[PDB]
Design a protein around this ligand. Sequence first.
Ligand SMILES: [Mg+2]
Ligand SMILES: [Mg+2]
Ligand SMILES: [Mg+2]
Ligand SMILES: [Mg+2]
Ligand SMILES: [Mg+2]
Ligand SMILES: [Mg+2]
Ligand SMILES: [Mg+2]
Ligand SMILES: [Mg+2]
Ligand SMILES: [Mg+2]
Ligand SMILES: [Zn+2]
Lengths: 92, 36, 229, 146
Amino acid sequence: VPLPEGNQLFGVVEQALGAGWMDVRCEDGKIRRCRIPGKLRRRVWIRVGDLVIVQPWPVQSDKRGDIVYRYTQTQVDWLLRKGKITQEFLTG
Amino acid sequence: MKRRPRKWKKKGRMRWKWIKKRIRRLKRQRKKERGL
Amino acid sequence: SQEWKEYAKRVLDEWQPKTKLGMLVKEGQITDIHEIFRKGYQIKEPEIIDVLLPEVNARENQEILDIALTVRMTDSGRRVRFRVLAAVGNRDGYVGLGIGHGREVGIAIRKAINYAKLNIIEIKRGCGSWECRCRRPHSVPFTVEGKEGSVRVKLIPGPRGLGLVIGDVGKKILRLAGIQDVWSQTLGETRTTVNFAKAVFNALYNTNKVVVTPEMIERYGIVVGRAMP
Amino acid sequence: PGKKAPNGEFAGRKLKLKRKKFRWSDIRYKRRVLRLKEKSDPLEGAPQARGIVLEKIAVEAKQPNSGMRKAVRVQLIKNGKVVTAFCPGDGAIKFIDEHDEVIIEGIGGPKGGSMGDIPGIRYKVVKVNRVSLKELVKGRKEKPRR
RNA sequence: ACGGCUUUUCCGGAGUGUAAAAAGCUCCGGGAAUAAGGGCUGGGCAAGGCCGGUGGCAGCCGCCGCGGUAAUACCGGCGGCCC
RNA sequence: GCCCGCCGCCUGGGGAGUACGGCCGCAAGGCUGAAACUUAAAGGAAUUGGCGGGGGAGCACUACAAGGGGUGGAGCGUGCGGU
Ligand SMILES: [Mg+2]
Ligand SMILES: [Mg+2]
Ligand SMILES: [Mg+2]
Ligand SMILES: [Mg+2]
Ligand SMILES: [Mg+2]
Ligand SMILES: [Mg+2]
Ligand SMILES: [Mg+2]
Ligand SMILES: [Mg+2]
Ligand SMILES: [Mg+2]
Ligand SMILES: [Zn+2]
């Protein structure tokens, strides 16, 4: 339900790299090696192909970022119906 | 090589004989790259 | 001292001895604490020491050296047991050391105090330091050694007024025996309290194993048992 | 093994040689005499140093602890090297900004190294723009030059 | 809280001191007046089983270890300990 | 074990018997041998349990063997997951 606020933007998980590292495709047509904060790492399980919010790192904000929130099925369905995001971004 | 009989114990490590073989393989390569 | 006289009288009447030495003490054939040593008797009744050395029951003459709890493993969990190490003495010439076990702390303490009385010994005191030649029984009369487990202890005579230069366990044990000044040297693992205490106890016992001449008794002021001014 | 040797009255030379030979197996003695710490110390034997802050970072705690520790990268003025320094206190990282100058010192762990659940960090910040950081964290003082 | 006392120290003077000064020292007048901080508080290691915040976050931690909504261990109040 | 001699070797775990230099060997290799950095244990002997595709002794139709009757396929009664 919460939306990106600032430099944050959506993203689609592509492949997990191990040791809490994911490979997320963002809305600006860039692939980023993203790091999962440990606070939500322990309680929220993330799997390839999900809509998430990613904030790029302050330095070298082109290939690194942090994942802050995961969108459930109802939230992504509501977003698709509202029209803030399209279907081809999710499906690739 | 020098003997370290503490290395032959198997708890928490691989077999010493094969570590020795790996080291010797790695030393041949450095020797051959030196003469070139 | 006055209270302990009537305490000893009270214990003496309502006691039914079970052994030979107990029978001798009850009958009045043995009257002093020194008469039960150096002849091979067995000591199995704690009332003997109560009648003959009543002041080992004073609160100030007893010491709880340590308390530990140990575990035995079972398919239904861990079973806990207590071990208590204790010592007693009369602050004059006699001392004892004991260990007790139990399901709870109080039982263990009671048994440890009980076994310490059965392990009583008498020692020798005097003055043998190069820089104090005063002939008064405030230290050990000569260098002695003892050992237990990995612990080795050497006790060295010291000048009057120096204090007990030794770890705390040794301090308590030597204080209960009536010794005021000593130097020491140790080897091994002193953090194992049981072995440390036993090593000091053995070193004290070994004062009886050193051969001496009548001249030496006069020179070092050697006193056996009670000082008796 | 037999009796310790040599014990002879006229064998002083060999005895002194033996003790000198086996003293080099002592790591404390070898590092002092060869001056190994002096050759690699970025602080050059000083107890404190002055540097410039390059960026802020966060470091994860060692297992089994959980949390993030706030640190900075510092470039030393005396020799140009870059080290990492921890910022102690609750909310202390707010009083640091990029391009500030700081005074750093050792963190006080075993053998003059790191401590606790943050290995890899050997220093901590003491002053910021010539004002004590402990004061700023408690209050009682305000950071100058805005 | 009442009643009394003293003036090292503090304020204002005379002498002595000093190459000249300043300190110091002997007297005189006024008056309890002018004067306490730093660290620690789970064990090692002396000292709280109290209250309010935070909730594996923020933080502490020489070492061992605390913190996961009922924290004697973090932040603050009130107590207490060492110098 | 108690004593009288001489020589060799060791000084927490790893990095490492490695890198660099030297000598020896046709070659394969041998002898000599650091540091930056990393880490709070690594290592020994013995104890109580639990486990073994280790041994022995015993036991059970919620085990087998010898048997009697079935459930699993259809429609329906009822409980559960999912939607
Ligand atoms: Mg060995
Ligand atoms: Mg069982
Ligand atoms: Mg033995
Ligand atoms: Mg407090
Ligand atoms: Mg205490
Ligand atoms: Mg070579
Ligand atoms: Mg069955
Ligand atoms: Mg059957
Ligand atoms: Mg059916
Ligand atoms: Zn004396």
